[PDB]
Ligand SMILES: [Zn+2]
């Protein structure tokens with residue numbers, strides 16, 4: 624089985640649960656799963672405990688990741704009910720701003736309850752820096768409206784339904800600056816699989832779609848800018864427990880599933896590289912990684928087991944699905960980081976890419992005229 628060399632892939636939506644939920648995952652275990660999945664750079668989400676919604680929590684998370692991460696990273700800041708206008712000094716050091724717009728009681732929304740709060744953030748957050756929004760169903764149209772009123776771009780996370788992707792398609796057709804990502808469980812899992820998973824294992828936000836939803840995503844792959852795992856590791860105790868948190872662990876399964884689709888002719892290799900490397904780079908202004916690449920074997924057929932080796936979630940919703948292709952070797956900045964069942968760079972090898980000279984988002988100087 625001869626190998627294919629790819630650049631280092633980028634997963635822009637990962638929940639790594641450190642600080643505060645390290646029994647579900649930490650930086651060291653999460654970045655190990657990332658490397659086993661062909662991913663050499665990740666963007667970790669801010670719904671940590673304490674949440675990353677202030678400069679002190681960001682400084683803490685940044686150094687915990689510098690000491691724990693095995694691959695390179697950037698950290699998101701979280702929009703709060705209170706921090707609009709307070710993040711200007713540290714904004715450039717984050718991956719971007721995350722707005723959580725789920726319509727339910729949860730401390731992932733960090734108090735964001737009102738469209739007026741969204742506007743305050745779109746107006747105070749530096750215009751040259753990225754904003755991503757968790758928005759489901761009609762909320763996507765709402766956030767797009769806020770972006771146009773403030774005349775700036777927005778990135779829509781885990782698009783999962785026909786109505787969402789057709790609305791994004793209409794916005795793009797009118798020249799609006801919007802991009803979006805789709806997660807693997809929304810392209811390969813459906814309502815058909817909720818019987819097997821159950822309401823406990825199968826809870827995820829955005830929830831699994833119907834066959835028509837999944838069908839519309841594949842039909843409109845041209846509208847999708849990025850693939851991202853939405854890696855949301857919860858232990859199986861918590862997924863089956865009383866109040867089950869939403870989220871699937873998918874860092875280790877993302878590439879095997881997509882390479883299977885490439886082997887079946889459902890999308891090209893180029894299409895995959897646009898969505899796991901080039902577009903993540905340009906949307907979040909992520910720098911290249913020197914001497915970094917991934918070798919994959921496209922011929923090895925296998926079945927997804929009950930749990931993948933490296934995530935502490937210790938379960939996967941893709942169990943039993945047959946996949947073609949495997950990650951064989953990852954080289955990260957000159958060093959062998961992974962080979963065929965074992966990660967070989969220690970915790971702390973990863974670096975914060977926003978501290979690289981090439982990793983800052985370019986901006987006009989302060990003394991530039993108003994225009
Ligand atoms: Zn989300």
Ligand SMILES: [Zn+2]
Nearest residue numbers: 636638668853
């Ligand atoms: Zn998420």
